[PDB]
Amino acid sequence: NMLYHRYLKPNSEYYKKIEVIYELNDIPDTYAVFLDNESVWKHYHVKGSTLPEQGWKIHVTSSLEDSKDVLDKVARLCIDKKIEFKHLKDKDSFMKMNSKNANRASSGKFITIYPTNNEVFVELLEMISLAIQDFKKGPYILNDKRWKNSNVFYRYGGFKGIFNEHGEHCIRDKEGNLIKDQRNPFYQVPDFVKDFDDYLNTINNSRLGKYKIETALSFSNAGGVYLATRKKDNLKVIIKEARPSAGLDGAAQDALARQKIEYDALKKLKDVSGVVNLIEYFQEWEHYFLVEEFIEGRDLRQWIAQEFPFFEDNNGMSNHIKDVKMILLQLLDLIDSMHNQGVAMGDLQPANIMVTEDLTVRIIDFETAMPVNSDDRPAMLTTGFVSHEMKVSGARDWFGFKRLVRYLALPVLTSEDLEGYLQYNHLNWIKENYGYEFYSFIVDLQEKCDKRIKDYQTFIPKEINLNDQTSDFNLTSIINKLIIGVESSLTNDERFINGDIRQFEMNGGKFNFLTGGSGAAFTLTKNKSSIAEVDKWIQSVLLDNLPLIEEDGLFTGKTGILALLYDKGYKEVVLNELKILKDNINQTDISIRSGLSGIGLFVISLYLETENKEYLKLAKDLERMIKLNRAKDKQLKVKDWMAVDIGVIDGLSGVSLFYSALYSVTQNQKYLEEAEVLIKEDLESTKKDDVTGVLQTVDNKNRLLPYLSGGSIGVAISIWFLNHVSGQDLYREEMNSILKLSKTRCTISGGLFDGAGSFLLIPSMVKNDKNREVILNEVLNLLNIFLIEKNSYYVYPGQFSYRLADDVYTGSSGIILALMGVIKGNPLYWLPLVNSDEFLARTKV
Amino acid sequence: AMNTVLELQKLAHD
């Protein structure tokens, strides 16, 4: 999710890879020097010799500057000893592996060393500590054991590739001959080489009982944060660990700086009782613990989540108005207070501000604190509350408040790339739902900040004119203008369109229906638009790439694409591809998104189109695989960080779609009961709200979810479809409680799967025409928060509205499909099925 | 000493 930062190429309206060397030569022979597919590592390879099926490996840790020497020093005591090693290929690589938000299990590992075996191991330990004795002690590797007092670390693990089906990394044991690889924040020795480990344990040569330490709040490569309780009191407090040379930021600052800068600037700000005050500070162990004054309550984000009203509750937004009044009024002086110390709050956003059960406001976390008037580029930028045209420290602090002013009124993230367009959208929304009163409060407070910025630097903003943006409630009007938008933003690269970051981050994401070109290609074909562009792209990109997409997934892989190809007349190609699917794999993934259910759904839809019984036989075989997989365990493993194991996309609700569909074509009642059951098991994990009348799902992580991906809207689609195939009206009461989500006021994001776009599906399920209109009209209000007028047409913001996207997952294609569903009264139209314009009629009872 | 400081990294969550 933090990956979005990586895709903010400046001066683009789309998510695009931010482009950015550890040199060295005097390279001997059969020293083959290569990179990878596109990894961090640079392999220095010798000769040709089986390096063990696993073994004892050495990691050298280094710090950023030394690094250049640390490589030259170790590389020679490796080149001259003709040893095999890899190092992080460049500065960007070092940053990412050591940054504040790198994985703990992998950080610090700068150079990896592979000794032939245990003697040269227990001897490179020696000959390497020595060459790097005069070098600043770098980040500690938490997965490894430290050797003596050095930057040299060791662990037992794999030297190349060892995977257990889908089960992470491994190392071939003996009887089991697999043993998965424990990459963890501690040192987790195997067992079959326990012998050699203890050997090394004897050749390797009350200040925190002060407090009890129960829970951990958060971790992070910089350190941790704990739920403490100092006896001599019972004063619950918050302790901030700081591992030196660890969690690097973008300024070359380590997790030491941001504790003695959350010191130099926590000091000056001791004289303000909004701000946080410290307990002590000390160099306990090699680390550091700056104990913090504990503050009960919730962060603003958590308050918004639980207290901001989402249900259209007819009178009572004023409740929230006074609250935004209580809070923001203070904060406005609390920032005034701070500024007479000469010190900038650095990173102002709803995470770093707290709120009790009586609306008391305090600013925590001071890793970013700077000198007002100074323009050193800030440490961590929080996109959505900053802009890269503020030059001076102080200005930036106030701009954070500015953006945050509106945020509390309408909590919808935006970035300084899209805020130009969406300011119009949100202000008009606020005016419409709060009154001119609250609108005015906002405008001024935001002109106030404009003052306190003009104090610091040249900053003439552009002015109002809300009338320049108006809502569109005509479905056909929206479709057409979103289409033109897509037609107006064809890349002419392999992707066909700009989509989510999963385009670059995930297997097949440039091509597949979910974020790839197939999804826009498909949608353009539905509106009979851009035919030659679609053909060009199919002809010169897609076909060539098809045989190379590894996944069979409906959204993630080949099957979605095959739907497009078949509907475009490429029967032969689908035909050949199906010949290969029948065997391809019967995986353990049953999801609609990427598993056997989504594949089986496609297969059924192809059977309907072709009337060829081979495909029915294939659908039945897939069922048998799903059934068994369902038996393997009542759990779902996950891949995509936004996935959850409930609902129509990644949950059992989606598995039910397959069963319904298979029902429609077999007439076998057994499948119908499996469908009902799979729904049922999902309904069990819903939470009906007593206050407001709405059913949402409930995830493991104790989120309440409305959306198509993970939430109740999806569940409803599965019910609607069961009913459609069987002729029943099951779960009518839970169905009604889900459609009540129509009254939702806002969502953080806009998209089909994870945002406002989900709600569009609600109307396609309502059987009444008469309540369809009220409902349609409500969800269009939601959508108009996100619709962007641009030239003559519309474009659509991707996730978190930081950048535009045209894809199915987040972008305009997802929305176009949803709006066409409404028209057609088809809540399944976002599915990439063969001739999906006949599908409903062909599956109807 | 470092049996605690490192054992902390091991501690509770949700």
Author numbering:
A (entry chain B): 4 to 23, 29 to 213, 223 to 862
B (entry chain A): -29 to -16
Paper passage:
The kinase domain phosphorylates Ser or Thr residues in the peptide substrates. Subsequent β-elimination by a lyase domain yields electrophilic dehydroamino acids, which can undergo cyclase domain-catalyzed cyclization to yield conformationally restricted, bioactive compounds.
Leader peptide residues Asp(−10) to Met(−22) are bound perpendicular to the antiparallel β-strands that form the N-lobe of the kinase domain.
